[PDB]
Amino acid sequence: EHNFNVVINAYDTTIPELNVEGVTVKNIRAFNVLNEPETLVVKKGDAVKVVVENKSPISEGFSIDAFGVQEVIKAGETKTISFTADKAGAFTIWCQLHPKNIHLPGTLNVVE
Amino acid sequence: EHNFNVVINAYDTTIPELNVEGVTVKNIRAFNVLNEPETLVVKKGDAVKVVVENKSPISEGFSIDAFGVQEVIKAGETKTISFTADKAGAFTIWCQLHPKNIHLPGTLNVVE
Amino acid sequence: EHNFNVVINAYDTTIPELNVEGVTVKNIRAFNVLNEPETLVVKKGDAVKVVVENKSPISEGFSIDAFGVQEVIKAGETKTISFTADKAGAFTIWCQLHPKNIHLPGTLNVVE
Ligand SMILES: [Cu+2]
Ligand SMILES: [Cu+2]
Numbered sequence: 001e002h003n004f005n006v007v008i009n010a011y012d013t014t015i016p017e018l019n020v021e022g023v024t025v026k027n028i029r030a031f032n033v034l035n036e037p038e039t040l041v042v043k044k045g046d047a048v049k050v051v052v053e054n055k056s057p058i059s060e061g062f063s064i065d066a067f068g069v070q071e072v073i074k075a076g077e078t079k080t081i082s083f084t085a086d087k088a089g090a091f092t093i094w095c096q097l098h099p100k101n102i103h104l105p106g107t108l109n110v111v112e
Numbered sequence: 113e114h115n116f117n118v119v120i121n122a123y124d125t126t127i128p129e130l131n132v133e134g135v136t137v138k139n140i141r142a143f144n145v146l147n148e149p150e151t152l153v154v155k156k157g158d159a160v161k162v163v164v165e166n167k168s169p170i171s172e173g174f175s176i177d178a179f180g181v182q183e184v185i186k187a188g189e190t191k192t193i194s195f196t197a198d199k200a201g202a203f204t205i206w207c208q209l210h211p212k213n214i215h216l217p218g219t220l221n222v223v224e
Numbered sequence: 225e226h227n228f229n230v231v232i233n234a235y236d237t238t239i240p241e242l243n244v245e246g247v248t249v250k251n252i253r254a255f256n257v258l259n260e261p262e263t264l265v266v267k268k269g270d271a272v273k274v275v276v277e278n279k280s281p282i283s284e285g286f287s288i289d290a291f292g293v294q295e296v297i298k299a300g301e302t303k304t305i306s307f308t309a310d311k312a313g314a315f316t317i318w319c320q321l322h323p324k325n326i327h328l329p330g331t332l333n334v335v336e
């Protein structure tokens with residue numbers, strides 16, 4: 001055990017006119033890829049294992065610079081990423097393949 | 113330190129054109145519901161209490177599958193969600209009612 | 225000083241049409257500013273030091289109400305935010321200058 005489970009999902013949302021519970025919102029359009037969960041918290045020295053399941057219809061990236069993690073998970077595939085969180089801090093979990101405000105970044109927090 | 117306070121807010125942002133400090137951006141249109149804060153970090157075994165106030169115009173969801181948390185908070189209503197974080201890991205906090213890239217997910221991190 | 229490092233980046237994404245790996249995405253338009261990373265996890269009591277480098281084209285905000293943190297970092301400037309997380313909990317890290325769903329909020333988690 002001990003592995004985290006991060007699922008990468010794509011969302012193509014277009015709602016020209018939202019009308020629910022007496023509330024109306026217009027021209028909603030957002031396309032994003034999300035890491036679920038986005039945040040991983042571990043202790044310094046912890047052996048980290050992240051099972052990344054890419055549910056996006058295309059290749060997705062999973063990078064954490066501080067620990068030399070820069071992976072590309074093929075569409076519909078799963079890749080287990082392992083590394084030792086030998087440095088305390090907050091590190092961005094990001095996709096090197098797509099714009100960060102499309103594929104939203106997450107965070108790897110390594111606490112003392 | 114007795115419990116967590118999460119406010120669910122809706123943001124209807126429409127900025128056809130904006131120039132600030134000489135920098136221009138055009139056709140900004142984003143409608144989102146955010147959990148504030150999005151991330152909750154607890155220790156394994158903690159009796160978690162999340163006071164969720166829904167300031168969104170419509171009913172909102174708050175789910176954490178790993179702990180059987182699945183709530184619907186009516187607009188303007190505040191609900192206390194209680195569960196024991198009996199499993200360490202990272203668990204997506206999401207809305208089971210709306211598109212995940214509209215109502216952005218958060219994370220419940222349960223550390224050893 | 226091994227402190228926290230956060231970079232505030234702006235993304236002006238516009239993709240009317242793009243076909244990648246046989247998948248076509250259309251009408252993508254998102255402008256956001258992100259705190260990278262968005263999540264900071266600390267222990268109640270420790271002296272927090274956050275070095276915020278603002279890579280946004282304009283002045284950016286960094287606020288955490290619970291600890292009276294509220295700064296405005298000029299474009300291209302780096303500012304060190306210092307405070308003591310004297311209260312355990314989850315607190316929203318937000319930009320007090322821009323819309324919450326444009327400059328996405330983060331979280332400061334203070335673990336007891
Ligand atoms: Cu991506
Ligand atoms: Cu929702």
Ligand SMILES: [Cu+2]
Pocket residue numbers: 257283284285319320321322327
């Ligand atoms: Cu801002």
